[PDB]
Amino acid sequence: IDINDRFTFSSLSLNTKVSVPVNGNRFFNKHIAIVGSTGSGKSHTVAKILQKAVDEKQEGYKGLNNSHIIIFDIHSEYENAFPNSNVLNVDTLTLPYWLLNGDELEELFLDTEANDHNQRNVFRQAITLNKKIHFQGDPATKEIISFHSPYYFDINEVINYINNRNNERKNKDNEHIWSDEEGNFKFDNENAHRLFKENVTPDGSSAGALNGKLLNFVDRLQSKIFDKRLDFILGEGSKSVTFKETLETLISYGKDKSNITILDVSGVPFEVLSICVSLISRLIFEFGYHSKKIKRKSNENQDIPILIVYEEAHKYAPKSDLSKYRTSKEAIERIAKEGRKYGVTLLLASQRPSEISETIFSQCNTFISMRLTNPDDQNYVKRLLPDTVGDITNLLPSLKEGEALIMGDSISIPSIVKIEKCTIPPSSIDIKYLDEWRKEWVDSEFDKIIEQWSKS
Amino acid sequence: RLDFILGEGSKSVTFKETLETLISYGKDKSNITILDVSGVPFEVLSICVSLISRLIFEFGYHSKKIKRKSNENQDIPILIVYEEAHKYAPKSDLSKYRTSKEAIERIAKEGRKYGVTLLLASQRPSEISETIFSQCNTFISMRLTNPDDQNYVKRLLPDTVGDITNLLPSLKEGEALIMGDSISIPSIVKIEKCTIPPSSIDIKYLDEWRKEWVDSEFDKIIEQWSKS
Amino acid sequence: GVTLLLASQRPSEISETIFSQCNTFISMRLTNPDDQNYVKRLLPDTVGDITNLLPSLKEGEALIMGDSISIPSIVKIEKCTIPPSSIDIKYLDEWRKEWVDSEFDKIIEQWSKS
Amino acid sequence: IDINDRFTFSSLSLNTKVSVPVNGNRFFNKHIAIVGSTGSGKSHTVAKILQKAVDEKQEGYKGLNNSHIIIFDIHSEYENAFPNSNVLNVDTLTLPYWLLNGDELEELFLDTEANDHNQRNVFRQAITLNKKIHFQGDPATKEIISFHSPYYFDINEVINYINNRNNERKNKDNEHIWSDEEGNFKFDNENAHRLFKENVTPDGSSAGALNGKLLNFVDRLQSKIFDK
Amino acid sequence: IDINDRFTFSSLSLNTKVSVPVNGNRFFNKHIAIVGSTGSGKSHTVAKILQKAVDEKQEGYKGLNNSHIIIFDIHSEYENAFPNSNVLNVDTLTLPYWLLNGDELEELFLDTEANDHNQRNVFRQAITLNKKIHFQGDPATKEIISFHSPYYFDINEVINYINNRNNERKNKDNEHIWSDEEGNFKFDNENAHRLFKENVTPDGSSAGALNGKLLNFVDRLQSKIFDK
Amino acid sequence: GVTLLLASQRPSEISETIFSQCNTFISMRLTNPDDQNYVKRLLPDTVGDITNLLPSLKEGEALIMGDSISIPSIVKIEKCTIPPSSIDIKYLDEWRKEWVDSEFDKIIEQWSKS
DNA sequence: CTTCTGATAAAGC
Ligand SMILES: Nc1ncnc2c1ncn2[C@@H]1O[C@H](COP(=O)(O)OP(=O)(O)OP(O)(O)=S)[C@@H](O)[C@H]1O
Ligand SMILES: Nc1ncnc2c1ncn2[C@@H]1O[C@H](COP(=O)(O)OP(=O)(O)OP(O)(O)=S)[C@@H](O)[C@H]1O
Ligand SMILES: Nc1ncnc2c1ncn2[C@@H]1O[C@H](COP(=O)(O)OP(=O)(O)O)[C@@H](O)[C@H]1O
Ligand SMILES: [Mg+2]
Ligand SMILES: [Mg+2]
Ligand SMILES: [Mg+2]
């Protein structure tokens, strides 16, 4: 490895005095998968890698460098490990509902499929038209606004529009005639924006095309917006935030600049967690994709690289083919296959290699295998290795806390290494189980645990 | 069948009374809490296994968050003993086992840091889901005659000490092999005899069969059978 | 008179029907085990110790068989004097330099137009 | 390999001085598969073979040879390897929509589950009729023209037909009367083509069968065409 | 092998003077499998076996013998080996579509991708009816005419019936009424045979059972038929 | 009286229930190990060191077993005086030629007329 | 004439 290409975070297990470095360029553009049994030290190994990546500064300046790391925290550990970082829990993070790219907007609001037609187009027509109403730029790019375009629309006018078309009344000439405080108006393309207001009364001889057909649809729509689970995305805080401040929040480019961004998704439900993982994975990927094509036309190199750390990837990217894992898997898989070119790579952390999907986990060209006692997990590590050097996998069950085997394109030979101790460790200390059992029967405060459990 | 969860008693009791009942923190305080689910059907056994495991894990999770606010570690650790784990957490990917498997898997995957760990008992290593046994650092093995099970124990060991699995079929009663970070070297041990043992002693077939034809009182058995 | 040249970093996801129609195969370093299993089964020829040979191929090293070459050979393909545009983001080298200012408005304006 | 059939683009790995040729006729006349991992050298290998392919000329002439290679460059990366070659970007490239067959036309315009079956049929009927009207060959092959057959058709005229069918006014005898500047005509197979004009007015005492149904379908089609 | 049974097409590899005969009867009434790699020589082996089997005669006559060999030549290579033989390419060969069975007719026309049952029933019903019309034999085997039976049917009439069933009309009496030059009839199995003509015009009140769901089925059938 | 001759370059893709109905097997140079292992199981007889024999067969060299032959023998099939020749496009011969102009205009008018 | 009810149907899964 070239001397100016060396990135070390560990030393050899057999000889402590020799440090084992990896090709620092090749370590991060080719995806990292770290696996090992429970309590093996994956979180400390991940934190030690990102700590050395933060302090990896070229000579000639003072201040924080160009590292960009996003950590998905489901156990709230790396707040302590990175004190000068930005932590974004669900109660304080705002991800707007107008940043959905259409496919997830289709899935977020509609729990139905295979039969909704009249409920479908009135949903997409309301959103697409409301984006042109609230658009404040030149009209040349107003016409190119579509359902998947990331422009602000009011969801409360969208519900008002669908609840109005619920109450349609046509006239003997077969067109819907409305009436508002300015006067009666035909329901047409240039007059469809007036249905966004609640105070419209229809005048008609007969019921309209969608009269009484969206009463079930509006109730499902209203009883999803006021979910406090989705208050980070569908709440009132997404109203006053814009596209720009969303990106400064995700990669810590705001008033507090940090190389590490941590998202506290610790005790949230899965449906909140699956929305959080799939949104930010797509948003970071498309930011890296679009910043790449800006740099293509400029023919310049001021690109920023982003690494996303996916701890507990079995929660949101498992091998199982369930539909509740579908939207989260596809966002991470897109980063796994195509994300390497645009500057968005992933750090995959899980406790078995055989539970993460093969379309995601086999795209990782570097590997940090800690202790694995499962015969199916060891066979995965053996088959990633040629049979000449496959005998080093025999030491996997004998690995105690701190050692792992690093293989991949970024390292010369696969070696059992000792990951360097974290002087600023994450908050994942092993509980001294017997020493906490020799004490008194301590009176656990049940009231304090319950009234947080209740709000959680 | 669901009277324990959907009965009239669910109205009266509170959240704090339930948590105190499950870990014996009530008026009668005990180190050991036993859930006697002996004759219940699977559909209410899987409900009991999955809900109590979820409640205890989230109690351990929320206790740690309270302790982390005061810059403290978790005060009370909880160990859950899953006896006869093949009934609710098997290798099979059937949909009936899904809720009970996922609750125990959450404890196995994530309960180490939250103070909720598990002791899992079953006949064979191969009849339990691999997700739970892979996370078990300590692995105690009694006599194992099935060759698939013996090779499963063999791969858990390093190859230098892997020859100790050859005494697995000849293991006597109370003779165990203890592995993991707890023990210095994997070794065959003799578990200390229980002065107060579980009431699961083998019944002497020849001693019982040598006596007279017993009347068996079918009315009392059927009366109990019909209640269950 | 219309023939194919199929280049793919994951040969396993290519359909077996179209991949079988190929007659000359250039096999570079194949680290993915499913890519190894797929290629070795569908290769028209074999070489000695091919299981360890495919991961061990160096950069620009190839294994060529087919009916256009008599002996399956390990070949060091000559370097491109005029190389194609290579996308190799040096994450360490870009992370060592100072925190660069991001033109978010330029990126977002192209993102919103898409 | 014969002396005139040799195509050398590589050299032996163990012996650098030895160059390994392939049968150049046999190499390209049968399909080639270049597989490898990421960064193995596939794109440089593809560039090297094609660079040597265009340099294979007979000594008699100067200028371009008869090699014709088309690259589906998904990463916009082969322009540097072949600077003199023609490159077709999205602004540069021009594919006519009418050369798409029936399945490709449907996937371009129509949507999964977002289109009713009657909305789909008027789309298919308009295109398969517009292909016949803009056909300028002999009329013997007009009857064999279908929706799948690729012939030139005006997609804006297709919009006008669909927009007119959205404004249809049915008569008392379940047919549609249409008024044009030439005159009034009942819609049938013989005069369906006069709906491709924009300036056609419907005459009827009642709303047509497809009236008010394709208005949603018009705006989705116009959104597709005017999308830049 | 008896000398009259001998059939020699090869000689021993190690001794060229030893010609290896096979039992020429037994070689051919039991199936032959010639396997090899590409470029091993199995096309030449097939050609040499058949040239040896064509020029073998009783020598009591002058002329062609009784060999009957059919080659499914997919590479167009055996024309050179047998110049005096009959070669049938796409331009020369005519294969009747009505000798196809039901599975082959489904594979030629239907697609398993869409797998629409409603296209499948009308397709089988049209052909099975049309095979009964064009059948000139005795009535006692007309009732066993099926979709799978190898009898002549008109594919343009089948398309015409299928296109007509896309134009069905539903009346207040829930019968389908059609108008023809011969007369006016109801959609009965006796009267369905006059839907095979294109010159019919439907009469009714509302849309029929199969209205609007066969146009994509007609266009794909018409795409196959008018494909050159 | 309707028998069949199977000539395949990938024997391991043939279904086992059809390939086992054949009695006489003319096994030429088999080179893929999957086709070698498939054929060796369903062959009615065996020969000495058939594993190394099959990829080592020379050009026209074959191996015939079955009811027809007495013993499995390595044979040289007789050379075809009138060989089966396929009209194949010589790419490097055509690509070495000058760039052709007259032919492209003739192809388009043929495509348009039919 | 329009409204409402009820029945038939088709769905996707
Ligand atoms: N290099 C190391 N040297 C010594 N102890 C270490 C080292 N790395 C980690 N540890 C210890 O490992 C313990 C548990 O490690 P963790 O990283 O929390 O386990 P884990 O990998 O997160 O497994 P799960 O599935 O998340 S519980 C910590 O309390 C550390 O003290
Ligand atoms: N014949 C060769 N000799 C030496 N180095 C080579 C050779 N071929 C490729 N390389 C090196 O390989 C690097 C990247 O190779 P590429 O061909 O661009 O990657 P690839 O094989 O196409 O994989 P992807 O998935 O397309 S990034 C180049 O920058 C060269 O340094
Ligand atoms: N019995 C034989 N003796 C000598 N040469 C042969 C023999 N059989 C085939 N060949 C040569 O082998 C080449 C392979 O041709 P072919 O039989 O078409 O291959 P394949 O087995 O792939 O069909 C031919 O060019 C021919 O000259
Ligand atoms: Mg962890
Ligand atoms: Mg490339
Ligand atoms: Mg051949």
Side-chain angles (χ1 to χ4, degrees), chain E residues 35-47:
Chain E
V35 304
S37 269
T38 297
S40 66
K42 78 192 97 58
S43 266
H44 267 59
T45 306
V46 163

Side-chain angles (χ1 to χ4, degrees), chain A residues 171-188:
Chain A
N171 69 21
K172 234 86 93 191
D173 308 56
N174 180 57
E175 85 290 352
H176 311 106
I177 294 321
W178 287 94
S179 100
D180 75 275
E181 92 306 321
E182 89 92 21
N184 320 48
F185 72 93
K186 193 167 108 132
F187 177 69
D188 64 83

Side-chain angles (χ1 to χ4, degrees), chain A residues 1 17 76 118 121 177 217 221 245 250 265-266 295 378 451:
Chain A
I1 298 145
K17 295 165 195 359
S76 286
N118 265 307
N121 331 100
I177 294 321
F217 181 49
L221 272 171
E245 307 173 18
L250 294 177
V265 277
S266 179
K295 275 310 175 190
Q378 286 133 1
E451 63 155 10

Side-chain angles (χ1 to χ4, degrees), chain E residues 42-43 75 77-78:
Chain E
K42 78 192 97 58
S43 266
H75 290 297
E77 63 196 302
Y78 291 107

